[PDB]
Amino acid sequence: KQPISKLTRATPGSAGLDLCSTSHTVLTPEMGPQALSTGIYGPLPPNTFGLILGRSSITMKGLQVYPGVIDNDYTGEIKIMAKAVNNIVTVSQGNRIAQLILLPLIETDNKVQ
Amino acid sequence: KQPISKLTRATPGSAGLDLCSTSHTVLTPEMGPQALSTGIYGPLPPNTFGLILGRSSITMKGLQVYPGVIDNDYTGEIKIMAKAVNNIVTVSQGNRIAQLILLPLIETDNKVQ
Amino acid sequence: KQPISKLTRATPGSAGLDLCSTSHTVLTPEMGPQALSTGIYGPLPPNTFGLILGRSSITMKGLQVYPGVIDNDYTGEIKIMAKAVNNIVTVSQGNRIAQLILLPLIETDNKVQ
Numbered sequence A, B, C: 001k002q003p004i005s006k007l008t009r010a011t012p013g014s015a016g017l018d019l020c021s022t023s024h025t026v027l028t029p030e031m032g033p034q035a036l037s038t039g040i041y042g043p044l045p046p047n048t049f050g051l052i053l054g055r056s057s058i059t060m061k062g063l064q065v066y067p068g069v070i071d072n073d074y075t076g077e078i079k080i081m082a083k084a085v086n087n088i089v090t091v092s093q094g095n096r097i098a099q100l101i102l103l104p105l106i107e108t109d110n111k112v113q
């Protein structure tokens, strides 16, 4: 069980923190959305929230990551919502399949609940 | 006809403002993208713009929300662009089906028009 | 070969910088994800990164743009990852098919590599 601080960037100017799948998983289009486990857990740095996005090279290989919001105070496991687009997709354990982007969390006076 | 300030957050640390559908709508994959009405209207707080994203629990139930940009000065109704992925999806009136995230709008010297 | 500074906004309050396709391209659902060329190149302004998103009017016409991350220091050509959802889609040369959003790039102590 690892915190976000254990993630790595591909390059200093890379916006994304790479996320791997902890299981070998096979996906087909008729399966629809599947939640892949990452072994990485929230919460995020103060005043930030997260967006999970696909890696372009993975998207182009037929695995669609659906954009997901990670709330600042989420303490569960970060999962990747993914679907094979057209073809059979095989995700091996340790393949980097998504990236976490950190964004400023803006305060508003919207009521909470 | 309601402003964004009428939206609520699920929790203090929730990044998203929840959006409901004001109509009962049935969606099938062969329908392609449909724009669902929310009864909520722009514009946004100064120096901000919006992103519409799916709720994870809704995505996992087979309703794909396509990420949408809400411009700072948009004064129309916020619509959710959505598609049933694999199966028949029934949206009831009042179901929260998307979330609005607020982001900083960066100024640049790009020409306007 | 053009820099991001050559892009235009539709309106002063438009969050997105519009991206065109430099080729006439036909897309069908069975083709899966295709990378469309824009003739626009990174890198981005300092302390920023990019997100490529669909235009709503294009999404509603059946062309799905998959959200893409443009890293701050990317110096290659910005491509649009796109898929025809349900129907045959014809992209003409010069049609604006996506938009680039600029976001703050947050520094963290995550290891780089």
Ligand SMILES: O=c1ccn([C@H]2C[C@H](O)[C@@H](COP(=O)(O)NP(=O)(O)OP(=O)(O)O)O2)c(=O)[nH]1
Pocket (backbone or CB within 6 Å): A052, A066, A067, A068, A069, A070, A071, A072, A074, A077, A078, A079, A080, A081, B010, B014, B016, B054, B055, B056, B057, B058
């Ligand atoms: O891709 C994702 C999306 C969300 N999550 C987690 C983190 C996020 O804080 C949490 C809640 O997600 P959303 O608000 O998008 N989901 P939903 O509105 O269905 O649940 P809730 O009512 O708890 O907010 O689910 C992931 O692990 N992966």
Ligand SMILES: O=c1ccn([C@H]2C[C@H](O)[C@@H](COP(=O)(O)NP(=O)(O)OP(=O)(O)O)O2)c(=O)[nH]1
Pocket (backbone or CB within 6 Å): B052, B066, B067, B068, B069, B070, B071, B072, B074, B077, B078, B079, B080, B081, C010, C014, C016, C054, C055, C056, C057, C058
């Ligand atoms: O999911 C969305 C996306 C956009 N919208 C509205 C708000 C946004 O400001 C407006 C314009 O959207 P985009 O720029 O993405 N659309 P497009 O480029 O086709 O139209 P325009 O030329 O007016 O900018 O449409 C929604 O209500 N829901």
Ligand SMILES: O=c1ccn([C@H]2C[C@H](O)[C@@H](COP(=O)(O)NP(=O)(O)OP(=O)(O)O)O2)c(=O)[nH]1
Pocket (backbone or CB within 6 Å): A010, A014, A016, A054, A055, A056, A057, A058, C052, C066, C067, C068, C069, C070, C071, C072, C074, C077, C078, C079, C080, C081
């Ligand atoms: O839609 C996109 C997405 C990315 N790109 C370019 C810019 C981005 O900096 C670069 C790398 O994209 P990602 O990190 O999402 N891709 P991936 O992780 O597969 O490659 P890398 O290992 O180089 O980071 O590809 C586009 O031109 N269009």
Ligand SMILES: [Mg+2]
Pocket (backbone or CB within 6 Å): A010, A014, A016, A055, A099
């Ligand atoms: Mg990458």
Ligand SMILES: [Mg+2]
Pocket (backbone or CB within 6 Å): B010, B014, B016, B055, B099
């Ligand atoms: Mg939520």
Ligand SMILES: [Mg+2]
Pocket (backbone or CB within 6 Å): C010, C014, C016, C055, C099
């Ligand atoms: Mg536009």
